[PDB]
Amino acid sequence: METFAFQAEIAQLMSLIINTFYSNKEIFLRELISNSSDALDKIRYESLTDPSKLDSGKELHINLIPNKQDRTLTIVDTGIGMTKADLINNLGTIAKSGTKAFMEALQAGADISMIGQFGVGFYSAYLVAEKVTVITKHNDDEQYAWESSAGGSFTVRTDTGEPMGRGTKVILHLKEDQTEYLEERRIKEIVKKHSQFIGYPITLFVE
Numbered sequence: 001m002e003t004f005a006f007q008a009e010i011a012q013l014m015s016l017i018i019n020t021f022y023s024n025k026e027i028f029l030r031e032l033i034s035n036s037s038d039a040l041d042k043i044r045y046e047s048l049t050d051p052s053k054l055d056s057g058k059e060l061h062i063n064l065i066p067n068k069q070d071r072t073l074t075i076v077d078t079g080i081g082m083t084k085a086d087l088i089n090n091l092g093t094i095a096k097s098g099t100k101a102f103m104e105a106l107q108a109g110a111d112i113s114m115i116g117q118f119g120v121g122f123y124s125a126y127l128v129a130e131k132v133t134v135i136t137k138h139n140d141d142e143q144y145a146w147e148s149s150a151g152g153s154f155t156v157r158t159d160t161g162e163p164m165g166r167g168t169k170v171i172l173h174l175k176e177d178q179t180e181y182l183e184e185r186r187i188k189e190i191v192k193k194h195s196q197f198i199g200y201p202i203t204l205f206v207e
């Protein structure tokens with residue numbers, strides 16, 4: 001396990017999301033589903049030039065998996081996935097530029113719900129999660145786990161968990177007062193409100 005420091009801008013955005021009073025927390029789910037949809041569109045498009053890119057799995061889907069015992073909500077997709085360089089380097093560049101644009105937009109009067117327009121919608125996970133774990137597998141690299149509970153650092157390690165084929169799992173270790181996002185009726189309500197037209201099957205698992 002390697003430990004990395006967040007740069008100042010993204011660290012400030014994580015604190016803003018964790019500390020600001022903002023009741024409309026449900027938008028995190030739309031943001032993560034949108035990220036999954038974009039990752040699925042990317043692998044699908046690449047497969048039109050190179051069909052062997054789906055040798056790691058033909059199915060293009062999104063699964064929502066609540067676990068009351070573990071207090072986790074997992075968003076699983078079979079999209080393009082992320083390489084180690086994406087996790088450490090490329091996405092750090094996006095986090096910095098997207099945060100700067102978002103903070104500029106907020107100071108003007110924009111809302112936290114607009115975070116996805118700045119490419120950093122993933123960070124809306126911190127509206128509901130104390131810790132976020134990303135398990136990912138890209139065709140050009142091995143399976144990795146990125147993780148952060150904020151506090152200025154994140155970790156990356158090769159993941160020895162169940163092999164994924166290709167894609168990403170965003171595991172939300174929910175805050176104690178955010179367990180409504182484990183309830184079937186609540187998740188169904190949010191998906192119907194914000195994600196009804198996503199171009200991939202979204203399966204809401206139950207317990």
Ligand SMILES: O=C(NC1=c2ccccc2=C2C1=CC=CC2c1nc2ccncc2[nH]1)c1cccc2ncccc12
Pocket residue numbers: 006007010032035036039077079080081082086087088089091092093094095119120121122134146167168
């Ligand atoms: O939105 C996506 N992911 C991510 C973010 C989106 C924007 C910025 C940083 C993102 C990161 C995401 C996942 C894991 C780490 C990460 C990150 N690395 C960093 C290094 C240094 N500083 C800050 C950092 N933030 C995403 C990307 C590609 C395929 C996907 N598939 C499904 C769901 C999400 C994705």
